[PDB]
Amino acid sequence: MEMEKEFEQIDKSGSWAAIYQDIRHEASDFPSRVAKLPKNKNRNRYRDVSPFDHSRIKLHQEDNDYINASLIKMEEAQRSYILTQGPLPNTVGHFWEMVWEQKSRGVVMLNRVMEKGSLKCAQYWPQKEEKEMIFEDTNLKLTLISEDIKSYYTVRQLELENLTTQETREILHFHYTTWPDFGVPESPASFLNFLFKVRESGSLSPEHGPVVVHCSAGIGRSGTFCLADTCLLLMDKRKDPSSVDIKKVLLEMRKFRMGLIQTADQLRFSYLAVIEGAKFIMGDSS
Numbered sequence: 001m002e003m004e005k006e007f008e009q010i011d012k013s014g015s016w017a018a019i020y021q022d023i024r025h026e027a028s029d030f031p032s033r034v035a036k037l038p039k040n041k042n043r044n045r046y047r048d049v050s051p052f053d054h055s056r057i058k059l060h061q062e063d064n065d066y067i068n069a070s071l072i073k074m075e076e077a078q079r080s081y082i083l084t085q086g087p088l089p090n091t092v093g094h095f096w097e098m099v100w101e102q103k104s105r106g107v108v109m110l111n112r113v114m115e116k117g118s119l120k121c122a123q124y125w126p127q128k129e130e131k132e133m134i135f136e137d138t139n140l141k142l143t144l145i146s147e148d149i150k151s152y153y154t155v156r157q158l159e160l161e162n163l164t165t166q167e168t169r170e171i172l173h174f175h176y177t178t179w180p181d182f183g184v185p186e187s188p189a190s191f192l193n194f195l196f197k198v199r200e201s202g203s204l205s206p207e208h209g210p211v212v213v214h215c216s217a218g219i220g221r222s223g224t225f226c227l228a229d230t231c232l233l234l235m236d237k238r239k240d241p242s243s244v245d246i247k248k249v250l251l252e253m254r255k256f257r258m259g260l261i262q263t264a265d266q267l268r269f270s271y272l273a274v275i276e277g278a279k280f281i282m283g284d285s286s
């Protein structure tokens with residue numbers, strides 16, 4: 001397995017930061033003019049994380065169509081993802097409008113609402129069945145249907161209702177709750193399990209709109225999720241799985257949203273996830 005030995009090489013040489021800087025300097029740079037318009041400043045959580053104009057998700061409202069969200073299209077893998085920031089108190093309605101308009105079936109959340117004593121995103125889903133949320137600005141209603149709390153993640157069934165047309169849709173919320181406040185998980189086992197539970201739900205499948213994936217900024221943990229998913233799918237599709245180059249896949253995804261994978265530790269973790277996921281498939285039973 002050519003990837004595992006590249007991993008040992010980099011580890012032995014302690015050159016993860018070196019590899020990561022090469023990726024940073026090779027990464028695409030495209031205009032992000034809409035994101036920097038002054039009227040949009042309170043729609044962005046971070047000054048330096050903007051969607052490229054060419055891949056940004058547009059809301060269907062003539063008013064202001066801006067949301068900090070990007071479409072990542074992986075042609076060969078036939079996967080699409082929407083990566084977005086954790087919603088702000090003033091953008092929770094826009095977030096659910098995007099979910100509605102894009103026909104998404106799943107929302108993947110990779111952070112806790114509070115980490116390190118600070119708020120990382122708004123509480124944007126209801127916490128009790130009988131206390132639904134209404135987003136008056138985008139005319140949507142959100143009801144908690146069920147909630148299944150597991151050791152490393154929680155899954156919620158939500159009902160989204162378009163109050164204007166009275167159409168309703170079932171949305172699955174996949175909430176990974178155990179990413180550490182600092183650094184990355186020591187083992188990728190629970191993260192890979194989570195990813196494949198999202199897969200089995202149908203939320204990544206082509207009959208639905210793109211999954212919505214977010215963390216704090218929508219580039220770091222979120223990038224690790226998409227990169228691992230796409231790499232593992234490509235290894236199943238190609239005649240030669242060892243031809244999959246995680247660095248090249250990462251650079252292709254960075255054509256669609258800047259900053260994916262924020263630290264050298266996240267880069268190493270992404271390799272480790274792909275390697276261990278591959279090895280699990282090679283020993284798979286049935």
Ligand SMILES: CCc1oc2cc(S(=O)(=O)Nc3ccc(S(=O)(=O)Nc4nccs4)cc3)ccc2c1C(=O)c1cc(Br)c(O)c(Br)c1
Pocket residue numbers: 187188189190192193194196197200276277278279280281282283284285
């Ligand atoms: C490929 C995705 C996946 O990758 C994983 C890696 C681990 S791991 O971190 O503990 N590493 C690991 C663990 C075990 C093995 S193994 O040698 O025991 N191979 C297999 N045993 C049963 C089936 S396959 C090889 C590597 C654990 C769990 C998974 C995992 C799953 O949790 C998982 C896999 C599939 Br396929 C699946 O349909 C679902 Br649902 C979950």
